[PDB]
Amino acid sequence: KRLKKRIFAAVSEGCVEELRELLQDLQDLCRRRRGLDVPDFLMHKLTASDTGKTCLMKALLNINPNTKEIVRILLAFAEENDILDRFINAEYTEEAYEGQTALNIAIERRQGDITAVLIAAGADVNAHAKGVFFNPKYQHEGFYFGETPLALAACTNQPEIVQLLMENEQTDITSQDSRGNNILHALVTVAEDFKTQNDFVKRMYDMILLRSGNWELETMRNNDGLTPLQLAAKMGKAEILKYILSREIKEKPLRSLSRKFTDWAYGPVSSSLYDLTNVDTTTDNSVLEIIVYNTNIDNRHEMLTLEPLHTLLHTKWKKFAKYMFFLSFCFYFFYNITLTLVSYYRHKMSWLQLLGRMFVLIWATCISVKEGIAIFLLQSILSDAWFHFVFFVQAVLVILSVFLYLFAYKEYLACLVLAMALGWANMLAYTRGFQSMGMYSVMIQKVILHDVLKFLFVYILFLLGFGVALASLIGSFSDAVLELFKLTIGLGDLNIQQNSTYPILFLFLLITYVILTFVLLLNMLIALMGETVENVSKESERIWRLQRARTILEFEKMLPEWLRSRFRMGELCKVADEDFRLCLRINEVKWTEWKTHVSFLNEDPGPI
Amino acid sequence: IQKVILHDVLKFLFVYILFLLGFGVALASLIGSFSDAVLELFKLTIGLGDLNIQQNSTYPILFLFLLITYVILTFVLLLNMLIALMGETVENVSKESERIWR
Amino acid sequence: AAKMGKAEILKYILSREIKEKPLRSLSRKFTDWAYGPVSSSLYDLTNVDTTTDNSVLEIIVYNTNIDNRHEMLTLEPLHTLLHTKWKKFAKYMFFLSFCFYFFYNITLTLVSYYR
Amino acid sequence: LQRARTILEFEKMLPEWLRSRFRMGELCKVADEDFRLCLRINEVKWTEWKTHVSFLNEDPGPI
Ligand SMILES: COc1ccc2ccc(=O)oc2c1CC=C(C)C
Ligand SMILES: COc1ccc2ccc(=O)oc2c1CC=C(C)C
Ligand SMILES: COc1ccc2ccc(=O)oc2c1CC=C(C)C
Ligand SMILES: COc1ccc2ccc(=O)oc2c1CC=C(C)C
């Protein structure tokens, strides 16, 4: 048993001669074991039974410059012993690291020739790794490359290994794994910005894709049920998503697997067709929908700047929602006027007094029904869900107050005033929907209610400290609050200063409160400017790009299907043989670079 | 910047006058008197209204609420247009001034 | 290094690791394990932590005369260890001290003459 | 500063036996005849790429 560990030590070192003679000793052990015929006696002596690690495994852990000689001897030892398939394709037995198959290790240790010999040995190169480490619940715990030796070298930027694994016979590029992912998913899953990662995730996405040659291995969906394009949306990885939409290929026999088809070019002017296979909302899950209806990811302002999203989003405003938002704006504007006039300022022939109150009741319900479902469908109060709360609350209190008049409880009038009060509050809520005027204010209403109230929570507590102090100078306590609030106004004067007890002490506590208020009110004035400059100033139009585009698709589901069927952007076009696609046309002009053109949708440039 | 300050302050004032008349009909419901309620609430911007006019006939607890909500929100809004004019009109209107001067 | 407050040398002390085998003992920031792009490390705590009467962290705190204390605390074995001591002790300790003195001021003003 | 000032100021206020429970880091062996209390921090790098030869352990994950 010491002899086994001495081998593991000889595994751990480059002692070539010491490694050889122990195998000569182990060969003599196999000779003396006649009855076993050494199937597993070879296995038992070369492997710790608790962990499943072998001699070839542990040698690939510890890399020395004598490692290549260790490999060629270990493979020479197994081949007389005829158990190399059992030897090389051994795997881990514990639930962590589960089935690692140290061909995986040599990829991770980046040894190309050592990898080539194991391929030349034949090592089941589509070996699915498992284990809690390879599929971690947390980011700090493990590393999720997607359980594939091919995808590992892809994820670890070793393109020659990606090249060398590419032309094996039983490679099976289309493989799936635990969590249901394909090789492109993990490439999306493991990606960052141009900071901290430089374009290899893009390029290794490209390099494997040219070998593919089929629309499948993008049409596949995971166990979550998502395409790599869909998973690009849900993960929100921006830099890969730019590459997907503008993926064009000049090289002829596989120009089919391409997007952004070049329509025509005539010198500095060209036109192009961006594909709409799954971007537009004609399908239940679309690219544009997932980017809108998620708050948890990040960075939604960046992704919407990208081109086939950006123009298509602009067109849907122009043909639908600029009419739709202005119409919704005018109806609720008439609704608030309809509330306040017939409150008490104004029943047989008086039709328009009665039909006016009827018009209030019918429209407030449909808002309350639609918002009541929508709130029940769903973090939230930071953006737009607190707003959709107030629309529902204001609608109910209109309905609730009139129903108090039916049961004649006297608070029907008082609840009616609160309903009309919040009716103008939601009238302020449409002011963000203009391009400019609400949006610098509304997102800073998020900020100015935060920063001034924390000053006011100081200041009201700063108020009541001085208030009980002067009340001790001889409800009168509530009157002392009202007296000291006049000092903020300036209404208190010299004659009220003529105290009964200690005029010298009463003269001190006044002027200390005056100056410190001038200290504090100047301080929040200064500190708001230095903090909210250029950060809240930019984040304002960020949410303006959000909450507009939020509502645009929210208007889109409100339209009927037959009227949607008229308004379909883009057009059915033929980019290749036996293919017909709806695509979006965008004209543009470049001047800087200059190239002759070989890829054409048409010969004739102009619109026919 | 008279081109600019008439644009940016009036859109605040078109909010604020509409922000005025919403509170104006609310306190008028607390018992032309409607035009007098505008003149009463404009005194609050001046500071002329005081404690004795607060002694309402109906619901003093509700009349105490609608005053102080208008005071703070006015201090919110008038501070907001003060901040937003500085961050927007810096260095762009400041350069475009001498452009038109040329 | 702490008392003089020389920052640039102090970064070299804490992350002083050596790959060269026969003297890898005289090293700090021991590499735990690495698997591709993910690695773990062990920063030593020979004299940094306050288990000894004079420690590195103590001298950086309890001096005003030197300079530049914001720079030195950005350094790594200080920075994480300082963050952990907030989380396991002082966020409970400061909030508890905050609530007692908050109750204390209310306890002062009420029984002044109101009751 | 003043946060981290008070943190160590709270530290001396604690008793020794309760401090003895809360000891950050762990006793580990980095070399022969050496045992040290050290702090573990995980991190991720992408830019440079090197094969690894210096190891505390062969097995990456927490056991
Ligand atoms: C009005 O159309 C919209 C609407 C929303 C967004 C949101 C993000 C964005 O970056 O772009 C957008 C556009 C395009 C604007 C123009 C001037 C072509
Ligand atoms: C165009 O109609 C609109 C417009 C705007 C809104 C705003 C919020 C909302 O929840 O509902 C709305 C509706 C639906 C009302 C009807 C009568 C179908
Ligand atoms: C709350 O933990 C603290 C406390 C104090 C300091 C002081 C200096 C410093 O630069 O870093 C600090 C941290 C670390 C914060 C995080 C979020 C890891
Ligand atoms: C946790 O206890 C606290 C909390 C906060 C402070 C603040 C300043 C101070 O000088 O002393 C303090 C103490 C010690 C009091 C006791 C009863 C042991």
Give the biggest beta sheet of chain A.
4 strands, antiparallel
Measured distance between first and last alpha carbons of chain A: 86 Å
Distinct bound molecules: 7-methoxy-8-(3-methylbut-2-enyl)chromen-2-one
Order of helices and strands of chain A: HHHHHHHHHHHHHHEEHHHHHHHHHHHEE
**Oligomeric grouping of the chains:** part of a larger assembly
The count of β-strands of chain A is: 4
PDB class: membrane protein
Keywords: TRP channel, V3, membrane protein
Entry title: Structure of TRPV3 in complex with osthole
Chains A, B, C, D: Transient receptor potential cation channel subfamily V member 3
Explain what you see:
This is part of a larger assembly, with 4 copies of chain A. The first copy, chain A, is built from 25 helices and 4 strands. Chain A is mainly alpha-helical and 608 residues long. In chain A, strand 1 and strand 2 (269-275) form a beta hairpin. The first copy, chain A, is extended. Chain A has helices at residues 2-12, 16-32, 41-45, 55-61, 67-81, 84-88, 103-108, 112-121, 149-155, 159-164, 183-189, 200-212, 228-235, 238-245, 287-292, 300-303, 307-341, 351-377, 385-406, 412-429, 439-471, 476-489, 503-532, 536-556, 561-566, and strands at residues 261-266, 269-275, 571-576, 579-589. In chain A, helix 9 runs parallel beside helix 11. The termini of chain A are far apart. Chains in contact: A-B, A-C, A-D, C-D. Chain A binds chain B through residues 340, 343-345, 413-414, 417, 420-421, 424, 427-428, 431, 437, 440-441, 444-445, 448-449, 452, 456, 482, 489-491, 528-529, 532-534, 537, and chain B through 11, 15, 18-19, 22, 25-26, 29-30, 34, 47, 50-51, 59, 62, 66, 72, 75-76, 79-80, 83-84, 86-88. The structure holds 7-methoxy-8-(3-methylbut-2-enyl)chromen-2-one (4 copies). One 7-methoxy-8-(3-methylbut-2-enyl)chromen-2-one binds at residues 304-305, 310, 313-314, 317, 545, 548-549 of chain A. Chain D: Residues 1-63 are cytoplasmic. Chain D: It is found in: Cell membrane; Cytoplasm; Lysosome. Chain D: This is Transient receptor potential cation channel subfamily V member 3. Chain D: Belongs to the transient receptor (TC 1.A.4) family. TrpV subfamily. TRPV3 sub-subfamily.
